[PDB]
Amino acid sequence: IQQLPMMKGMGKDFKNADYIDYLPVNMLATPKEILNSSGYLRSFPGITKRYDMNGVSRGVEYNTAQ
Amino acid sequence: IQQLPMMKGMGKDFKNADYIDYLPVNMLATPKEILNSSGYLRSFPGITKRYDMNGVSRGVEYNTAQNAVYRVCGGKLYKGESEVGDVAGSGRVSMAHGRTSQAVGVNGQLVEYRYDGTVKTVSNWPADSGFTQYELGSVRDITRLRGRYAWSKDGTDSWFITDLEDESHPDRYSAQYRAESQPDGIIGIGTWRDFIVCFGSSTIEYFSLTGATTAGAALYVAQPSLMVQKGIAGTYCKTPFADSYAFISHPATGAPSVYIIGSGQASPIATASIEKIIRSYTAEEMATGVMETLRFDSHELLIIHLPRHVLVYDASSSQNGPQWCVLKTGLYDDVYRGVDFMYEGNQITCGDKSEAVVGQLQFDISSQYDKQQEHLLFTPLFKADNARCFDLEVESSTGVAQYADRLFLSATTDGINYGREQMIEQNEPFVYDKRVLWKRVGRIRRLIGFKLRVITKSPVTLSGCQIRLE
Amino acid sequence: ADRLFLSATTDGINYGREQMIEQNEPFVYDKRVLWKRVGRIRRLIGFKLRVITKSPVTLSGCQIRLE
Amino acid sequence: MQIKTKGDLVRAALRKLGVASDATLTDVEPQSMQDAVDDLEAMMAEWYQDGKGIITGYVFSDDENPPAEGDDHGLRSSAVSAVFHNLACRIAPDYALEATAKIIATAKYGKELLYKQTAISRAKRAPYPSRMPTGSGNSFANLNEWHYFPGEQ
Amino acid sequence: TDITANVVVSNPRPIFTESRSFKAVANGKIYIGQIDTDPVNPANQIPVYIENEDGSHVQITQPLIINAAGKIVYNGQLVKIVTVQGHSMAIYDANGSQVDYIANVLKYDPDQYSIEADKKFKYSVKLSDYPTLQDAASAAVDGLLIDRD
Amino acid sequence: ANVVVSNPRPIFTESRSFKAVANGKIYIGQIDTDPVNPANQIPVYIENEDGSHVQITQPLIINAAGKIVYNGQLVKIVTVQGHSMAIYDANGSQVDYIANVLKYDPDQYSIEADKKFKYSVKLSDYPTLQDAASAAVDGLLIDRDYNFY
Amino acid sequence: TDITANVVVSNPRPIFTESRSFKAVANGKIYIGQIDTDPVNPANQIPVYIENEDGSHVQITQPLIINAAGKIVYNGQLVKIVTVQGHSMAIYDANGSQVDYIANVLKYDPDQYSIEADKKFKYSVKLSDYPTLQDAASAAVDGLLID
16 A cells, blocks of 8 residues: 655656656645645635726735725 | 544534534643543633622733732722722723722723822823823723833824823823834734833834933834734734733734744744634624633633634643634533633632623632533544444543533544434542443444533543554 | 546656546535556556546545555 | 344344444444345345255245335244354455354354254155065055055155 | 423434335435425425534435434434425335325424414414513514503 | 424324234214214315315225325325324224314314404515515515515 | 315324334333433433323423333323423433433424414404494404404
């Protein structure tokens, strides 16, 4: 019985035959000391529409005075 | 033979299927190197009625000049058992004693009482005197450094000071000070080792006094090497803990979370599950969260009175990771009873939040007033396939009970909902040696986790759970 | 009941066939996600775990009986 | 006898194996009970051999009645201690368990006691051969012209 | 007379038995759906909750499983099932036949005049029958009538 | 999440043993009277799932399971007045006698309540306001926050 | 036709049966206590009243006996044993083995709706029911209505 890590996967690219690791797309990594392993992988939270605005976002800043 | 730790139990929630651990309900953790394990779990002490007072607790502070405990405790002020004065206003108040006056600071004005028997209020100097005549505002918090007070104007960068010879007027020449690295209101104020700590919405800044010997020239100068760069969520989310303040982060930063101030930075002390609980409240609800510190025996507790949670952090027992606990009164989910804990004489006097009464902690009884209480313990999930558990034997210490109270245990296969509840007696009124065990637990298909519900009004001690796995 | 796609590489660049296993059920809190046969590996092998859902995805611990 | 039904046999076998009983915290899912009672029916069908093999009071379920667990089994009181022991021995490979040597010895003893009475009852001696004369001492079958034995027929 | 005594002590775990004979249904599926609909079709089903000790209601898959005892069972253990009142019930055999089908379980109520009577009247508590004022006030809906005591 | 899921079908068993009262007879008679003699009984009615009603002979028959059966299918029996029921075994013994299934009489009390109570209706029970006002007399309540359109 | 429907024929007696089997608890005991408590101790038990054929209540000791059929027996078979509020049941078997323990149970008594209706509703005798006004006023209590 062998355990295979999934937090990061190795590989190679066909362009120049170099070893590049494949990052796990769209899911986070959390260490929590799970039943038999140390850490579990959970997907990124999903977006839901809240308001309708004028256009594409261009800036943000959390005003502290108000 | 395997041993199952019960100081903290893992699980999952049915809402979004995430692994969140179950904190032990209403039971503390103490490492003491017990017979075969390292540490035992003991129930929280029970409350017993001591005095009858006007209303629910609203503030407390241990006067050092006079060896007595002051508490408003609802409608009108109390010193120990005596009355000595009347206070106006409903809510929560911030107290800061002095060497001539007490000071309560209700509403938006610094009402200060006097040991002589008179009441005074902080206000501008008379115009006939010919002084600088500041523009005072509403007050939020109060403190005292050296021989003078210090309060913060509501919703503004300014925090004022108090004169020496007369402690009822701001000052003669210099009393206007401001915080002002960043534009943020002063949520709270406090003192720490001759530094006036000004808790902003986004930053924390330290002020140290300097020898002026001049008319109105910068009595206090801000120290910039000790800035923390994090705010506090609410007015009362701060305490004297260890040598730091241990606040709760403001929503201005990334997310609310408990912290502890270091030399010049804040170090978190809250696990992810605790921050999940903190995020459950809205911004307005979080601002009404009280914090305290209580130390009995070798313990050092940090109690957070959230609207629906009474989370408790035990510093001494957190050898390997934080050790959080939650307290509750009723058999069902309910907020804990008893707001303010203070050490008077050789006993601890707890307040109240739903009754007009005050009570003291007692160690040989586990019931608040005269009602039984619930204690829970959770074993973390284990993954063993096709095994059969037989001898689950927890080790209790008995002989201080009034009736042969029983214990409920159950098992989970999916980690969310529990099976049948088996009744085993775990305590006998005057038997000091007995075994608490269950002879058959049966096969486990994929995974299993246990539970140890106990309903008593007598001290409960459990230390070391072992099961014969095959 | 969303499904999971898994596949294997022998050279580490391009993948083989995609096998479909369901990894989630709307209201079942206890189930196994496994494949019973993977077969001989000649020189080297690596895996992949495509998942296409609109529901939370949690995976923790992949083990293979090596012989 | 408290073991009247087939489900009682299955539960006794499970208790003997230690998998589950009345005092256990976790219990077995009903489909496993269905599989176990099907295995019991198959095992009992294999011993009977249709009248030729081991003969014991047993009624096979009809299918017109849906639940085969609930209906009673015509087992006499002596056969119960053998039947569920053998059932528990056979169910062990279904799980990862292996039956204890005591259970194996008890099953052996039980099957031996099941078959001993039938073995005694079936030990019969064949009649005389066809070409076997009856002597002159009978004096009646000899005088009735019936000198030779009839035969096995 | 002695007290209100509105709660009856009865069996807290339902028992499902066969129709043609007298035996508990073993491994028999149960489907619950809306009024006057077929619960077999998944479109007509309604949520079904397990009520644990804590009071948290956890939803599970619609086909409930019965054990050899005739009681609803989840993963080998008995559970308490709570749903919104007014649900059609369809009990199915393990083989796949139909044992019972109930269009609306509220009709199988010993007193059905109560349902019609509750609709066409207003509720008004009288201080006469109740001993104290607080008891009448607690159980008071839509006004009261002040009488003696 | 209000009502526990339970079997509403009536199962009739013995009083001194666990049996199914095979082939028993149930008599539905007049209130607080002996229903065996043909003198004092009340009509009984089948209530199908759709809502039709059919007349039925007095000696109700019990199936082998213990459930009331007419012809070859299970049935639900409804009577208009209050009744007293007496269950007998196949051999003629008495299993149980209930003088009052319900302590009051639905018919006479229904007439009296029609005489002596206010005929006002509420909005909560009726989905739409027009449907409520259609069957409402002498008053209406507007209980829930009805949406305009 | 479609006649009015008022009552349905039903069995008014409950049966307590063994879990994991289809046997009836021979002579076990049923303890009634508060919601999440242990019903065994006297402190957690709540009063239990018999409900006779005529409306009346007789209080009895908490441990309830069960006959062979699985129905609560007392001396002869006892009627509806009505308690108050929501209780927790801990059924025991004959030899003191726990059959089942349940936390929260609540089932309302279906009989005697007449008393509840009398205590619930408003009195208005109206005028259409009575021929004349004087007799209507004679039986009118706390209200009256016209045509």
